[PDB]
Design a protein around this ligand. Structure first.
Ligand SMILES: C[C@@H](NC(C)(C)C)C(=O)c1cccc(Cl)c1
Length: 536
């Protein structure tokens, strides 16, 4: 129905600035290839696991112990990502509250936040829109670096509090009963994107942007950054690896098809990404023509690209207040939907392990939301964009790829792809097929391992638009990244130590399904013969 139209904030906010940073059309090849190779198979696998096991993300490993750390890693990654996603909803709320006027604040250089170097056009950042973004919302000119953070800005704290309160009151009494937060997330993004796409092709100088978008230069390939970014964006926008798909599938009809769900979700994700890229590059070409500069020196390459691009296109339409209000309401709805999904995933995954948290939902929800608010207090300071840049690089970078790789390895090699394909035939009626099984078993681990190894080997020091972080910010970032990657060996060691027996009865009590326990004494254990390990 309308619950398959999964359009996320990572498709409207994050894809545009990753596509512009990596050249343009030289970014869609590693994206589409990675989609085909590993996004659909893993989305299918996650949907099938969640549907069949009828449980959350951390207690879903009742089919194979020694692997519960994969759930605790994706529970922590979800937390880290919500400490910075709620600051992009606060920005949207600030812009929406500033949009209620007949003279938009991002059109003139005669305000109190304008530097005397403001040039009206009639990396830069001396334009009215960039000046507004960097000096009236962020107040970044009062910070010198990550070492000089400053105090939180009250005008953004008052917007963060509203977001936190809304999230808590939407999550405090069970899950939302559906069809309340998505009947507008489904329709509005497509209408707004269509209007922007049809309007932006008639602007002067948009042809250059379109040509730059539909042009592939191969020198940008053969470099690690494009492939790493494409893989991370796939496993950020498809929803896999965050533990949300399993929790969502845990509440569903048993015989609901997931083949069609996976195909439709992937196709719509690709279409929306392509349309967003087209619109963004058309606006970029327009601005490049207006300022008489190249298309590569006209806009920032950071996380605030849309908040400088989209207002510029809005200010050219007829009735630029109605459209601004519509666009920012759409952004707010998308952000609220994504935050609700992530927080629900966390709460369910933590309340399935322990039974004392299932009768204290108010207190637990309050705890999670208040922790998120307190930890997000760091990103609304006068130098919070640096912290947001650190967290948007190291919270789900190599760690998410490692988690997905470990989950795929675990399932396909230790539980058995034969059993995985035999319990899907038991609940749908058809056996997956050769392509899906081969894809999972051999093609997903290989490419995921290649990406992880290349990312570790070819690391690049962190920078923000000519600003170079001190050499300890990278250490802090790697410490954040390894905080979830280390939970997998630790749980294996603890589980191995906590049981009793020899090497046998310990290596085998944590590799067989929990239900299949009274066959260890009989020694009827499949994983030890070679014919388990030659699955097709
Ligand atoms: C992966 C995706 N989650 C959905 C619900 C599947 C879209 C997401 O972008 C996210 C993940 C964790 C936390 C937050 Cl706030 C957002």
């Amino acid at each position: 129905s309308v619950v398959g139209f999964a359009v996320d904030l990572a498709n409207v906010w994050r894809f545009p600035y990753l596509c512009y940073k990596n050249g343009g059309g030289a970014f869609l090849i590693p994206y589409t290839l990675f989609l085909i190779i590993a996004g659909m198979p893993l989305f299918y696998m996650e949907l099938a696991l969640g549907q069949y096991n009828r449980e959350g993300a951390a207690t879903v490993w009742k089919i194979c112990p020694f692997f519960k750390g994969v759930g605790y890693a994706v529970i922590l990654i979800a937390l880290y990502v919500g400490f910075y996603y709620n600051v992009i909803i606060a920005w949207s709320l600030y812009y929406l509250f500033s949009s209620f006027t007949l003279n938009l604040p991002w059109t003139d250089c005669g305000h109190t936040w304008n530097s005397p170097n403001c040039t009206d056009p009639k990396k830069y950042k001396f334009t009215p829109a960039a000046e507004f973004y960097e000096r009236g919302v962020l107040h970044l000119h009062e910070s010198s670096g990550i070492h000089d953070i400053g105090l939180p800005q009250w005008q953004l704290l008052l917007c963060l509090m509203v977001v936190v309160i809304v999230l808590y009151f939407s999550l405090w009494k069970g899950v939302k009963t559906s069809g309340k937060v998505v009947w507008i997330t489904a329709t509005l993004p497509y209408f707004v994107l269509f209007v922007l796409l049809v309007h932006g092709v008639t602007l002067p100088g948009a042809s250059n942007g379109i040509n730059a978008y539909l042009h592939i230069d191969f020198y940008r390939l053969k470099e690690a950054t494009v492939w790493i970014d494409a893989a991370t964006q796939i496993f950020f926008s498809l929803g896999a690896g965050f533990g949300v798909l399993i929790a969502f599938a845990s509440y569903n009809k048993f015989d609901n098809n997931c083949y069609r769900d996976a195909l439709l979700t992937s196709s719509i994700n690709c279409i929306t990404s392509f349309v967003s890229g087209f619109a963004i590059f058309s606006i970029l070409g327009y601005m490049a023509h207006e300022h008489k500069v190249n298309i590569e020196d006209v806009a920032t390459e950071g996380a605030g690209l849309v908040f400088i691009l989209y207002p510029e296109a809005i200010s050219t339409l007829s009735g630029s207040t109605f459209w601004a209000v519509v666009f920012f309401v759409m952004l707010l709805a998308l952000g609220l939907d994504s935050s609700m999904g992530g927080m629900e995933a966390v709460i369910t995954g933590l309340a399935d392990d322990f039974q004392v948290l299932k009768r204290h939902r108010k207190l637990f929800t309050f705890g999670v939301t208040f922790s998120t608010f307190l930890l997000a207090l760091f990103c609304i300071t006068k130098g919070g964009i640096y912290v947001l840049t650190l967290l948007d690089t190291f919270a789900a970078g190599t760690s998410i790829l490692f988690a997905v790789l470990m989950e795929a390895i675990g399932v396909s090699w230790f539980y058995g792809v034969d059993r995985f394909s035999n319990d899907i035939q038991q609940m749908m009626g058809f056996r997956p097929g050769l392509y899906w099984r081969l894809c999972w078993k051999f093609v997903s681990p290989a490419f995921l391992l290649f990406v992880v190894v290349v990312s570790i080997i070819n690391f690049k020091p962190l920078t923000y638009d000519d600003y170079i972080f001190p050499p300890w910010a990278n250490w802090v970032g790697w410490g954040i990244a390894l905080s979830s990657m280390v939970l997998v060996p630790i749980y294996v060691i603890y589980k191995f130590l906590s049981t009793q027996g020899s090497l046998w009865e310990r290596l085998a009590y944590g590799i067989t399904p929990e239900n299949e326990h009274h066959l260890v004494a009989q020694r009827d254990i499949r994983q030890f013969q070679l014919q388990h390990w030659l699955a097709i």
